Ligand binder design. Structure first.
Ligand code: LUI
Ligand code: LUI
Ligand code: NAG
Ligand code: NAG
Ligand code: NAG
Ligand code: NAG
Ligand code: NAG
Ligand code: NAG
Ligand code: NAG
Ligand code: NAG
Ligand code: NAG
Ligand code: NAG
Ligand code: NAG
Lengths: 733, 727
């Protein structure tokens, strides 16, 4: 006699076997009024205005073709389609793939001049159907798909010269992309970066591969660690309309400004402003000075010219510039003007309106909250996402600000579904006539289509009511999102609370940590993850806390950690644990802490801190010493590791040096052997240091797994392993 | 109450005294009175302080080892010790004139010397530096360069490459002086085409980018190193002209394919014996080469080639045995399998094919220790039919029937496991007895055979072990398929037949292994018995050694079968002994031991609750060519690929669902590569088996760093104590 009370829970197997599936609505705008979608492997074109769908491409159309199609890409005139197959992952964004090209208008694979195998990147012109692609580190161009490729570059060399693609560090840290190609708006020009890694040292690690490989492989990746020789970067614009079959193409270099060329620098942003105007942002290796150049094509010259009167300096007095890098500009149609997120005089990031010719801008938004990103710009309105609503830093809403009158701001998402939806992202149509809103929490994700013409609702695309239906008699956890005041400053935290939560009880508590610069682990987003399991099934509270260094709350918080990683942000997680147990429902004898990446670092520093607050912890792929991590990330916060910059704190902020203190706590240390990002080296050194002071601990390596330890089988194993470690630490049976 | 604790083991609370000596002549030996070195007289037991402690105070550096020239006139001081592989290292070397009492500063031996060695008589010095051989006729004089072809990782002159060091010569050096130092014989190895194993070395915290270590290492069926052998005449070296090295090419029977050099032994001043082994290691040949004055060359008459082959397995225990030549060099003695598979001393005439076996029986000769004009001295496990006992025996050469046991009766209760060290001409001998009682070192004259004196009785160690509740050892056999198989158990103190104890099967189980012996040991097993009241057992099943070929060759071409089945059957038989709690049976081992533990855990038998594998082989294609192929042939379709395929622990991953497993491996293991563990762990991950792991950054196969050795055993003890619900 159960009387239909919820006696199910969200179990480890539910998380690992993906029992409760979260439906999404993934679309691609092809025009200003139409988008593409995958119904049942079929591709439907959708009219957003009416709803009516014409089948664009039938599922069966290919794969008589004989390979598994990984992805596709329709030429922006809707006349061709790029078919991506033989997908082979590399780093976070990079990978190789075979490609073929199908002719929509005339129904046939292009059989001549095919894109070669092992193409590293491929891309259409924004208008028409010009193709640009890198192969063996060189850029090729095809004006028509079935015609021969024009070769733009000749200098590409594996692991040394990169034309049109990033190298390891630019990929992961600057452009969050493999592509270093940029077409001008009408496809006339192809901008590209060229990276030179000749002197960049190589990280080397064993790759064991299939048990068939008799001798392991040694992977060797150009990877600059803190203070090492960084790669150098050149930038070019070629004209794709004046290519020829009888003469190599002319690339026009645009050199970096005087102020950058004097030392180590980076290319950090490329952004076309018009058919003939492009903007570069350059950053010094010491990342507190950045210069935006704005370059015009000289018609008769055939060359590019960045006038020094249109240089714009962005610099930071209290830290580095940009959140992780300088914010990208959004130009007005004529390109005489642009909007850009920059920190205001009070430390809060806001939308500044710049004139191509004036130094001074005007902030069109302000307040003790921040703009997260500018999403769309029309002649009349600017669309952006901010955390202004109810002064909740971990919330997100779409707003439109009236270009002509900055006082007239309208929240587009806030009141749609206030209790279900406080975390929005948007997808605008080609010219912003329509938009999709993607609500992510605190309730179930909700996807919806909108006319910007009068900001009304067209339809609910996905309401996740299958999932809602499944969860009725599941004892799901609840989330609490709130703050505490330390030093007269709000600091936000979130608690995944076990079902039928009881403030009389004393629950064990897992502190889930990231805590890196500009991190936010305290938000209104809805998640079915490992933490959900622990709360629902194991009655553990999983909390996270955004203390000093965290993002989206202003520079006084974010920069507080500048030149000083492994200090306040570490200290604040320890205090977070105390504050929690001061709230009355936390078992002091059972407080764990865990984290991946920077989070692994913070966990490890916490456990080695000698605080006595934590019983145990798990570090996965942790950083152990900032001289081991990459330059562009690390130096951003740490400076250079040299006696005349900041070696002292590089040296003072290693988990190794705290080995002695681990005698006080139980430690699981996990790391994948093929981790190209946070090298296994880093954990290997933690282990050695612990061995040398006689502290026992738990360890697990993952053969051939990278930073995300994302293999299906490997993913299931680590979380299973961690669950055991946690369960036995907390005496859960 | 006090027991023998993990700390006691790890911090060596209870030390075992070694009376280690080195014979200087036929009636004198050196011994190191910690802060001193004495020459002792075997005759009278008196001494004279050979070398004062703080003579080399002045030196400045730490003196790792010393070495006296045969004629006593010089002493070679070794310092700057940099371990490499199991026997290999480099070091710096100074020479000290004793007749002068001053340290030689003239034409010194360079740093990073790979090997040094006095000639057997006089004071000549041959050393290897950057893989080339140098000789010094006098310590304070310019050295003559013998070889110019040496190249790092590629050409090894007078020193062995990785695989010959580990598996063939159990030594870094490949130089062999003739008896009176006239000739330097050496081998030359080519690794030009041997693939490299690569692994990361992380090094100290301050090294920003890990180093990648690369070592030429032939895994099963990979291209092997090639070898050439040379003899140079050190009495006729020129300062003007380059030294001239004569070559002894391998027999035609070996040159037809891949082969190995596996023994160099000088017979007389002008006679050298070489043993060569085919790559399929069941056919070896001995050459007997004589120097030719008139010709300047060496000659190995095909009519003096002695074949040693095997139809049932490989040849030799781990390699063909060494010959022991009568003084005139026209005859030699040698341990070979007889017609019934038991190994015994065969007496050979240089010109004649058939040897006469001089020992016989259902037991084995372990080794020939000394040969005189009238007696042959050997060690065997004959006494009381115990394969894991060792006793010294003299066999009268004029009448093979008159055999005396020199050590059997000395102390039968305390001593059943002996080794010997004879004087230069066999006039005296030192016995080491290593069990079952506390080790006991004695000095004996070989003329009347009396027992001059006790050298060390470990009476010190005896007095402390009264206070501690020590475990006992039971050594016995079970019968399978009408055949004896031996086991030992370390029984906890105050052992009660009526109680059910947890048991840990300690395994090696590799070919010619012997884990069931009368040796006394203070180890991890001692701790588990004394402190945690676990029974630690070992068992020598099929493929185990010193019990004849029938047993040893049982796993020929079939590694990962009978030796695995037999550890399980042992566990079964032990759990029918009534004092084994069979809800709590565990298995562990290192190397082969790890492989077998792993293979056993993946068997699905149901016998074992949990296990530990430390640096295990996971499949044989990952282990070196020489060891692996000796037992497994080649891993090709036309040979033994199928069984290589079937013998992997990865193929059994699914069965680990039934057991709790701990997999440990040092990341800088040159021998059994971490690869081997990485592939197991991956296999387990793919079938969803949870398990325990631990890597040891930059530890090699020993995991022998002070801290690392403590850390691993501690981790292992926690795992076992959790498995057995011991608090
Ligand atoms: C900023 C981007 C351009 C790149 N980037 C980087 C930098 N490589 C890191 C990171 C930070 C420190 C150490 C290694 C990696 C990172 C860490 C994350 O951790 C998740 C968590 N702990 O919950 C999630 C995302 C990111 C990421 O996107
Ligand atoms: C035979 C010699 C020429 C060299 N050798 C070798 C060969 N590499 C091995 C061994 C066997 C298989 C796999 C890896 C190593 C070995 C293993 C030992 O393990 C002891 C235990 N497990 O209790 C002890 C000694 C030895 C040894 O001396
Ligand atoms: C792999 C290698 O080194 N092969 C060489 C070969 O090219 C050369 O002709 C011969 C003579 O020195 O020695 C061998
Ligand atoms: C979609 O709907 C409209 C409604 O009038 C119709 O005219 C049209 O045929 C459909 N679109 C296309 C491209 O077929
Ligand atoms: C891709 O590879 C396959 C087989 O290796 C080949 O048949 C095919 O023609 C290749 N494609 C191109 C564009 O070269
Ligand atoms: C890359 O840089 C090196 C110097 O580090 C220089 O010699 C080389 O020419 C550069 N290569 C290219 C293609 O720019
Ligand atoms: C293009 O440049 C490469 C090398 O710079 C050269 O080999 C090739 O001949 C050039 N092509 C033309 C058309 O000049
Ligand atoms: C950048 O930071 C450096 C080192 O912290 C400092 O000396 C300087 O103030 C900054 N440079 C600029 C241009 O603001
Ligand atoms: C060997 O090294 C030491 C210290 O670096 C030095 O004193 C000596 O001169 C070196 N070389 C030789 C040829 O002895
Ligand atoms: C070593 O063998 C290689 C063939 O693999 C050959 O190049 C070289 O001549 C040989 N070296 C010596 C010293 O014999
Ligand atoms: C010896 O041989 C080497 C290498 O072949 C060469 O330098 C020279 O001809 C000789 N040198 C001496 C000292 O005899
Ligand atoms: C050592 O042996 C060689 C070779 O027979 C010989 O020339 C020399 O005389 C011998 N030494 C003595 C002391 O007889
Ligand atoms: C040596 O071994 C091979 C392969 O196992 C076998 O075919 C051959 O008969 C053996 N040779 C002898 C002489 O027993």
């Amino acid at each position: 006699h159960h009387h239909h009370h919820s006696r199910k829970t969200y179990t480890l197997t539910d998380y690992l076997k993906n029992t409760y599936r979260l439906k999404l609505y993934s679309l691609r705008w092809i025009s200003d009024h139409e988008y593409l979608y995958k119904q049942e492997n079929n591709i439907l074109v959708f009219n957003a205005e009416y709803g009516n769908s014409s089948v664009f491409l039938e599922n069966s159309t290919f794969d008589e073709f004989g390979h598994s199609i990984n992805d596709y890409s329709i030429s922006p005139d809707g006349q061709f389609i790029l078919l991506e197959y033989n997908y082979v992952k590399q780093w976070r964004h990079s990978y190789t793939a075979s490609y073929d090209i199908y002719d929509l208008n005339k129904r046939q694979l292009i059989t001549e001049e095919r894109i070669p195998n092992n193409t590293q990147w491929v891309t259409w012109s924004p208008v028409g159907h010009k193709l640009a692609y890198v192969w063996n580190n060189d850029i090729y161009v095809k004006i028509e798909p079935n015609l021969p490729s024009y070769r733009i570059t000749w200098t590409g060399k594996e692991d040394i010269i990169y034309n049109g693609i990033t190298d390891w560090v630019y990929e992961e840290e600057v452009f969050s992309a493999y592509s270093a190609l940029w077409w001008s708006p009408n496809g006339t020009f192809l901008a590209y970066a060229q990276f030179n890694d000749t002197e960049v040292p190589l990280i080397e690690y064993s790759f064991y591969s299939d048990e068939s490989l008799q001798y392991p492989k040694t992977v060797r990746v150009p990877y600059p660690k803190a203070g090492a020789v960084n790669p150098t970067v050149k930038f070019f614009v070629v004209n794709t309309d004046s290519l020829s079959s009888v003469t190599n193409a002319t690339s026009i270099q645009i050199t970096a400004p005087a102020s950058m060329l004097i030392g180590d620098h980076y290319l950090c942003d490329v952004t076309w402003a018009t058919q003939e105007r492009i903007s570069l942002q350059w950053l010094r290796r010491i990342q507190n000075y950045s210069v935006m150049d704005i370059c015009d094509y000289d018609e008769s010259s055939g060359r590019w010219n960045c006038l020094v009167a249109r240089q714009h300096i962005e610099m930071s007095t209290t830290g580095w510039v940009g959140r992780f890098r300088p914010s990208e500009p959004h130009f007005t149609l004529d390109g005489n003007s642009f909007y850009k997120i920059i920190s205001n005089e009070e430390g809060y990031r806001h939308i500044c309106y710049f004139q191509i010719d004036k130094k001074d801008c005007t902030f069109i938004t302000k307040g003790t909250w921040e703009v997260i990103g500018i999403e769309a710009l029309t002649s009349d309105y600017l669309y952006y996402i901010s955390n202004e609503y109810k002064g909740m830093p971990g919330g997100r809403n779409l707003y439109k600000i009236q270009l002509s009158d900055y006082t007239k701001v309208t929240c587009l998402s806030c009141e749609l579904n206030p209790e279900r939806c406080q975390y929005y992202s948007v997808s605008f149509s080609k010219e912003a006539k329509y938009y999709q809103l993607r609500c992510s929490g605190p309730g179930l994700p909700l996807y919806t289509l909108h006319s910007s013409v009068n900001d009304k609702g067209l339809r609910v695309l996905e309401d996740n009511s299958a999932l809602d239906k499944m969860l009725q008699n599941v004892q799901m956890p609840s989330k609490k999102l709130d703050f505490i005041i330390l030093n007269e400053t709000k600091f936000w935290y979130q608690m995944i609370l076990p079902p039928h939560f009881d403030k009389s009880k004393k629950y064990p508590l897992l502190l889930d940590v990231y805590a890196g610069p500009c991190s936010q682990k305290a938000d209104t987003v809805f998640r079915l993850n490992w933490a959900t399991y622990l709360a629902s099934t194991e009655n553990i509270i999983v909390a996270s806390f955004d203390g000093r260094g965290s993002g989206y709350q202003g520079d006084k918080i974010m920069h507080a950690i500048n030149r000083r990683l492994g200090t306040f942000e570490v200290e604040d997680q320890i205090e977070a644990a105390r504050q929690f147990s001061k709230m009355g429902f936390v078992d002091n004898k059972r407080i764990a802490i865990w984290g991946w990446s920077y989070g692994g670092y913070v966990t490890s520093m916490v456990l080695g801190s000698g605080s006595g607050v934590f019983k145990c912890g798990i570090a996965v792929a942790p950083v152990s010493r900032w001289e081991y991590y990459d330059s562009v990330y690390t130096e951003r916060y740490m400076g250079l590791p040299t006696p005349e910059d900041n070696l002292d704190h590089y040296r003072n902020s290693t988990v190794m040096s705290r080995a002695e203190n681990f005698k006080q706590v139980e430690y699981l240390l996990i790391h994948g052997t093929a981790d190209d990002n946070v090298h296994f080296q880093q954990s290997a050194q933690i282990s050695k240091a612990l061995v040398d002071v006689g502290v026992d601990f738990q360890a697990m390596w993952y053969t051939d797994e990278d930073h995300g330890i994302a293999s299906s089988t490997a993913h299931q194993h680590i979380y299973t392993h961690m669950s055991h470690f946690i369960k036995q630490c907390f005496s859960l049976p």
